Amino acid sequence: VETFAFQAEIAQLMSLIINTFYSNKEIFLRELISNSSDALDKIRYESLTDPSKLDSGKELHINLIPNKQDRTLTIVDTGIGMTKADLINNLGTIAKSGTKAFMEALQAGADISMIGQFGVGFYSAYLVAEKVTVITKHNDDEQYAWESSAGGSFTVRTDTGEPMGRGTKVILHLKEDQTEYLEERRIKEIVKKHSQFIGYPITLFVE
Numbered sequence: 001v002e003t004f005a006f007q008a009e010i011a012q013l014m015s016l017i018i019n020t021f022y023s024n025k026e027i028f029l030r031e032l033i034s035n036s037s038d039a040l041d042k043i044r045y046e047s048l049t050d051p052s053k054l055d056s057g058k059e060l061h062i063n064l065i066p067n068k069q070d071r072t073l074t075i076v077d078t079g080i081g082m083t084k085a086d087l088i089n090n091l092g093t094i095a096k097s098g099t100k101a102f103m104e105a106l107q108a109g110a111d112i113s114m115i116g117q118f119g120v121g122f123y124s125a126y127l128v129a130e131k132v133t134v135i136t137k138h139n140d141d142e143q144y145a146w147e148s149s150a151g152g153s154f155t156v157r158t159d160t161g162e163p164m165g166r167g168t169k170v171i172l173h174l175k176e177d178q179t180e181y182l183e184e185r186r187i188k189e190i191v192k193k194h195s196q197f198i199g200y201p202i203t204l205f206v207e
């Protein structure tokens with residue numbers, strides 16, 4: 001298990017998301033589904049040039065899996081996945097400019113729901129989750145688990161859970177007062193409202 005410090009800008013962003021009063025938390029789901037859709041677009045594109053990139057799985061889809069016993073909402077996709085380098089440095093480095101611009105936009109009158117326009121929508125997960133675990137598998141790398149409860153650090157470890165083949169699983173460990181997002185009716189409502197036209201099958205599991 002390796003422990004890393006967040007880039008200073010990202011720590012700032014996470015604190016803003018966690019501390020700012022903002023009732024429209026439901027937009028987190030849209031942002032995570034968007035991330036999945038982007039990752040699916042990417043593997044679909046790459047597979048046109050190299051069809052063997054789907055040897056790790058041909059199905060391109062998104063699953064939403066609520067678990068009331070564990071108080072987790074999981075977003076699973078069979079997208080391109082992320083390498084160790086992506087998890088630790090690449091995506092966070094890129095997120096620096098997006099974070100800066102976002103925080104500047106907020107100072108100018110924008111609101112937290114616009115986070116996606118700045119490429120850092122993933123962090124909206126902290127609107128509803130006390131901890132986020134990201135399990136991911138990219139064709140060119142091993143399966144890893146990234147994890148953070150904020151507070152300025154994250155961890156990365158090789159994952160010894162069930163093999164995924166290819167893709168990403170975002171496990172939201174929900175805050176005690178955000179359990180509405182485990183309810184079938186509520187998830188259905190949010191998907192229909194914000195994610196109606198995603199170009200991949202979204203299956204809402206039931207309990």
Ligand SMILES: Cc1c2c(n3c1CCCNC[C@H](C)Nc1cc-3ccc1C(N)=O)CC(C)(C)CC2=O
Nearest residue numbers: 035036039079081086087091092095120122146168
């Ligand atoms: C900016 C960002 C970040 C993450 N994703 C993106 C968003 C940046 C663009 N996403 C492309 C990659 C391939 N896919 C994804 C990336 C992210 C989340 C989910 C997916 C996912 N569901 O595949 C996750 C980590 C843990 C690296 C932290 C972070 O800074």
